[PDB]
Amino acid sequence: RPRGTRGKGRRIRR
RNA sequence: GGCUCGUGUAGCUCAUUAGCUCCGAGCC
């Protein structure tokens, strides 16, 4: 179950 | 100052494949 953004416009998956 | 990236023994919610919270570093 990933983490799409990381808050105020960041980018990761898992 | 901005742009991009880090699972960080990091946090939040719903069985998902994304969005929301903060902060650190490099490059231009």
Side-chain angles (χ1 to χ4, degrees), chain A residues 1-13:
Chain A
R1 299 187 88 174
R3 279 177 286 197
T5 57
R6 222 194 296 205
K8 200 175 180 179
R10 298 284 71 82
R11 297 186 185 272
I12 203 280
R13 190 172 178 166

